[PDB]
Paper text:
The gigantic Inhibitor-of-Apoptosis Protein BIRC6/BRUCE/Apollon inhibits both apoptosis and autophagy by promoting ubiquitylation of proapoptotic factors and the key autophagic protein LC3, respectively. BIRC6 promotes ubiquitylation and degradation of the mature Smac and effector caspases by serving as both ubiquitin-conjugating enzyme (E2) and ubiquitin ligase (E3).
The overall structure of BIRC6 is organized as a symmetric homodimer in a U-shape. The two monomers interact with each other side-by-side in an anti-parallel fashion, forming a very extensive dimer interface. The central section of BIRC6 is responsible for dimer interactions mediated by an armadillo-repeat domain (ArmRD), which is composed of 31 armadillo repeats (ArmR). The major component of the N-terminal region is a WD40 repeat (WDR)30 β-propeller domain. There is a long insertion between the second and the third blades of the WDR, which folds into two structural domains, BIR and a tightly associated domain. This domain mediates the indirect interaction between BIR and WDR and thus termed BIR-stabilizing domain (BSD) hereafter. The C-terminal UBC domain is highly flexible and completely invisible in the density map.
Numbering used by the authors:
A (entry chain B): 2830 to 2867, 2899 to 2930, 2963 to 2995, 3015 to 3120, 3145 to 3296, 3307 to 3457, 3468 to 3553, 3590 to 3632, ...
B (entry chain A): 1448 to 1493, 1506 to 1516, 1531 to 1560, 1752 to 1850
C (entry chain A): 1909 to 2137, 2147 to 2172, 2184 to 2193, 2306 to 2407
D (entry chain A): 2618 to 2658, 2669 to 2721, 2731 to 2829
The structure:
Amino acid sequence: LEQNFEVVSVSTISAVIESVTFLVHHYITCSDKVMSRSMTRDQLMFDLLKLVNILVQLPLSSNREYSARVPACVADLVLANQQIMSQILSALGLCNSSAMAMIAISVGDGLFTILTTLSKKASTVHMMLQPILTYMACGYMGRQGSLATCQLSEPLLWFILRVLDTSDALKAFHDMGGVQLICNNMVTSTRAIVNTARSMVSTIMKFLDGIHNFAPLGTITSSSPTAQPAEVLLQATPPHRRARSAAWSYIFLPEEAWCDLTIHLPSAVLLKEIHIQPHLASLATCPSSVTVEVSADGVNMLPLSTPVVTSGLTYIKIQLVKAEVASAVCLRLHRPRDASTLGLSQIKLLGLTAFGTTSSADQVSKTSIGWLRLLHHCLTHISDLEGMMASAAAPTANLLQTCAALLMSPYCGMHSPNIEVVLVKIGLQSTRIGLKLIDILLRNCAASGSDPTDLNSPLLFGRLNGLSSDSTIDILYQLGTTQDPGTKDRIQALLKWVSDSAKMAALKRSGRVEYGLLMPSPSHLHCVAAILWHSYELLVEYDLPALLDRELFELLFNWSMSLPCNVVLKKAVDSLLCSMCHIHPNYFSLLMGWMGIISLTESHLATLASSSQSPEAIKQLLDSGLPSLLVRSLASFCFSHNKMPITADLVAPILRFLTEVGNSHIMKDWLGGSEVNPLWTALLFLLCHSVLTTQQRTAIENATVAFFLQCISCHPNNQKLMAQVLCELFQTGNISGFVRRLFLQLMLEDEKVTMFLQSPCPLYKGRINATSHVIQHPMFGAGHKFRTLHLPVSTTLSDVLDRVSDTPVPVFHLFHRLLAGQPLPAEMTLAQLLTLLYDRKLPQGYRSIDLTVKLGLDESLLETCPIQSPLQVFAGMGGLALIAERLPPIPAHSLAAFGLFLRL
Amino acid sequence: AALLTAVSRQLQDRLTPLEALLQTRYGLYSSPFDPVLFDLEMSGSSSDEIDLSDVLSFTSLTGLLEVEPLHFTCVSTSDGTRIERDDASHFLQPPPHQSIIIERMHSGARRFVTLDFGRPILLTDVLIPTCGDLASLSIDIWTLGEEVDGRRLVVATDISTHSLILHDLIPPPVCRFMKITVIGRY
Amino acid sequence: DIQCRYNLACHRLEALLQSIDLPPLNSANNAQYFLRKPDKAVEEDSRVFSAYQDCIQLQLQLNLAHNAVQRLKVAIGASRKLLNETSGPEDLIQTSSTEQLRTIVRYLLDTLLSLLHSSNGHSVPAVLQSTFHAQACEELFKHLCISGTPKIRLHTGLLLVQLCGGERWWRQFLSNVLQELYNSEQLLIFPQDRVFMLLSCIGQRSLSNSGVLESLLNLLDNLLSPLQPGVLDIPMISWVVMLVSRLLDYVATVEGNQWSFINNNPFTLAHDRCISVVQKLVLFLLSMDFTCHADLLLFVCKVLARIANATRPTIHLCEIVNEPQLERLLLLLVGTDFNRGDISWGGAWAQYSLTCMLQDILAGELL
Amino acid sequence: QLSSVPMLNVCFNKLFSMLQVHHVQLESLLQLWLTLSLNSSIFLYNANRIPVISLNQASIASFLTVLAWYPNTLLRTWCLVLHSLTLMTNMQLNQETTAHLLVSDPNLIHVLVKFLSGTSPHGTNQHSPQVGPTATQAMQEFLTRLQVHLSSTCPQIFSELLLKLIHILSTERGAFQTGQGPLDAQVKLLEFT
């Protein structure tokens, strides 16, 4: 290494490189199954790799017979030789990430450094790309026509990334055809590999019930009759230091050279490490060499490796490179080199069982994810070559099914959002691929061939059809919202899936691919509704009213009426109805024509409220006079305990209906109108502050508190009116139970405001690793870009930005539509922001605060006073002295005095 | 059978999805939303499920709703055993478990603890758990005088393998003080 | 006052219950969510535990106070609630409390369990056949086991064992109940796993008849019928395979173990009914990919070996598998396509289970 | 009804044919063949046991060639080899016995040299050059079964094979002169000769 090689002949260099390459590949590929740890041959192999690294850097002379006396290089002749490059690439492939993670004391770092120097010293880029393409195409030993792929390790993956870093390398990679070969190797490796995830079998076994010792469960036997039973060696408690007496002592006959100790485990477990503790007081009694015999059957001992020298060791730790099943472990112990007695303190068998609580506590090589890592790098590294790589990946059969299965598999090395990006770009390359991806996500997720008899064709059986996660919601939303040509066909496919699902639900009710239509995801239906709402908001080029159909609207209405009101799927179909009523104002009038409004049930009221969440339907519902009819008839029912009869069971659905339609700001102003003002005091008179049964009274109590809280939610004249009503109630002895319900929950709990966040960068903190169906309104949208948080007004904007994303230097900045181009401080609360927005154009009692998160007068916003709470307006009207009068380890005299000064 | 079927149909009709979510996720089967509770039973006390492998290879106190749990203070002197706690609004709160601990137990002898309620009550329910360490047990109650109105409630030689269970006392005694005499196994 | 605090606790518990989402165990991702138990779910479950404990304690205090109030109303002289013969029985069951219904059904179950333990021949003249048919047994089993507490569910399950073990439709009852409850099309929110342990026990009590495991195998080969040339779903087939494995293990206990690693620590079926089941199990073994797991492969090997040893003519390896299919199965065992170097196909456990599988088939044939 | 033994013979002969082209791993195939032939036979390994799975002549020749050039054959791969070769000495071929096929094959002498001069060529961890007792016993049973099977037919070929083994080990650049290889296996081979 210290010498310099200048005029040395090329043939000698090539012979050295080939021989050392074969030797290092033989060293890495062939290793012992047993590793034991207490200059090294690893240092020898690493210095040999350093010598090869020096040799490939040598300049080459013009005649090329000898090296340059001092363009052409020796590295070109290394690249030309197929055997040397095949051995180097294979030797890096068998290397794990644990050797490479030192980044350079190990041999994997030496192979990485040699390959990086080969990439730097290549004359042309194609000369470096050609052995890489040969290694991808060849497989394990040049094998083709079967389910065999070359093993891609993480260091080799990193090297191929560093090769494909430059643009000309990516263009030459497409010219060689590497994208198609990566996709085909992905499909074949996904067919070949079975997942080792713990799945739902281990969940049922965990309920029905980092490596643990299984020596106390086993029994130890020795074939020598003179040997002690040695059961103290299997005890879990370690012997204390300087015990001066061996736990088990064996006397050696002069002819005997090996002593056997045989441990029979009660059940076969995976075995990883075996720990033998010699006698610490005297290491003369330590065995000279120990070999380990294991047996899966437990009667036929197939051992592990050569005997490990254990002379002069205070602790013998034998660790397996490959964990193997072993129902019985036998240990042959040699005679000690000087002493004639064998002294053992403790024997430990460390391992894991399957199927239990003990079954707990590299992935690129085990799974097929590294091919899609390479495909992700090729797609998303450079935007100019992105379309032509996406055209390369297009003709591959069963690619989309494989990518969806890798998307909804557990984590095997690469995060789901980059899988999502690959799926989005492949679906967005062409219209047919987009319709196919919509077919895979919604209706049929299986292989296009689907031949189990062939046994070499890929099959995607085992994945549940129509299955939903947040990833597929993002895929569907980004397919819907993208304004490339072919978008209208994708929206038509989504509406066709919704219509086919409604027809399948109708045929299920009648009692007469098919699984996706039979079970729709509520989150997928909400995603379709969000796509329709945001495409109507964006003023898209394709006519979205032309895509909507009246018969589809009728089918969705009947499907929503058939489902019970507590079902999440009814809320999803109602969100679709809300989107269609937003796009078509005539659809809401046709809906009231179906209602007969010119006999209401709870599902009727739920469908009416959820479809009437849209503001045009708010206006049409207010013009129809239906909430006017309900408020007059409800006030009549309150006074009892044009007019319409109201049953006692219907009262709490009416209050829930009024709450859900009073989520909107216009009907929030309407509930402050003069018609609804007798209703609040009438409800207080109805509930009487202690006729109705007790369960009905409790339900109407909860509905009344929720209705008043929805009325007063960040609406200052509404809470002023509510304070006037409450102080008139208190002015007219002791505090009742429902009165205290109202005061505490309506008044002293801080007001909470819905809040909607729009960010071009996707936010991933709120998303979890499970599926959930949370039906929200279609203006909020769906995907990782859109966040909805329901937070109190005392919560600061810094806590909001910390909750939507971790953001541990570009800094995310909050923005508002009214506050155009003005950054929002992190120190203010939501209440001061609401005061500012109520000063500006935003109406009082809006549905949700709209904040814009973009990556990178604030003190005047900090000086702005917060929104007064309903407690503040109520005490400003003076009702706090009234409740001080009506009311019958902190000291109690402080509380009594405090009430007396609340009188003041 | 017919009453079982009808009340089973109504019991299925009583179920709400939130209580079912509590059952399927947290293992909580009592209904928290319903204010009314019909019965409370106490047989053995310090998600609940039964070990289906072990059972499928007792006497309970019944009522417990018109009567009241009662806090007790051991202000009277106890000989041989001290009372330590395990770690009418006040009476409606349940009393803490106070397992007695003997600093030295020695076989075939007599020890006792003594407790006070502080006010005269009517005592109707006695639950003493079974204790395999103990051979015999007895309890003595009194009010006003210590032995003037003293009465023995029960003698229990069955405390080794049977719990001492009094479901109801049909003449309800007036009690303020009790002592419990414990005898260990021979 | 106690009612007011209890209603406050009920309101906060209701809002907290609306905060919760729950996955239905349809996929392996929800299963990994249950296995990891993430800390956000941990703190949510801790909040639910605290709110529920407050609710149940305040409910108990309210009921104690209310019955004390009723006792003092008796002490004044007001009578209790008198019962009306003019009121019909149906509205009497309707107006009653839910816990009253639970206590009544518990006492009725204990009473009926005493009737089945009769000294006169251990029989009931009417309810064994006339009162309990298949529809009534299915409905009552549903209404008391999905909605009820574990004690009342266990008691009605053992009661249905007593009444309908002798009926021929018990096997079709058990297969149908497992099929409708554990289907992925089913939306009933119920603890699936405790009902599954109940199903294992209720299968074990009637396991002396071979018809129950025969109907389970007929169900299982009906589910694998898309795989032989339809739509196949992993979870409910896994439920069926576990029930078959647990019943076969219980057969092994009533009658060391090669399949003890899968355990945490007149029965003989006919060949012609079993052969289609075992052939479909072989096709499912060969048809596993990355969507499937080796975790189901362990049970497919164990169930397949136990059925192959269970038949009175032991199933030979000739009819169980085709010769290219057997070559493929050994390629799954040995061969650089599927296990490469250090990497083993499905881990060491899958290869050990395949080896013990072929071991048990050849030991059954050669004996 | 039909015996599955001939189908097992056909597919295992196929696997031993694809051994040469790296289609199947050697040690796992040997472990699988040994496990099936041992259980069908109860579980314990015996040298007096005829395997139920019969391999042809070309299968044994491919197995011996693959061993004759297998790089860094690990030690319990070698024990699987020795137990398997003992069972093929027990195995009948359908003429010439399989022990005569083994001794008459020129690759078997290279197999025995590679076993007796294996030592620890990787040298990743400090290990004893001896092979332990079990490999020594397995080699002793293999040589004993060769002697028993060829005592009646042709013991001179087995004696000449043993002498050629001692000659190849004892020459220059050999296991005996350089000191490499197991001492125990070479001493037991010397005692057997």
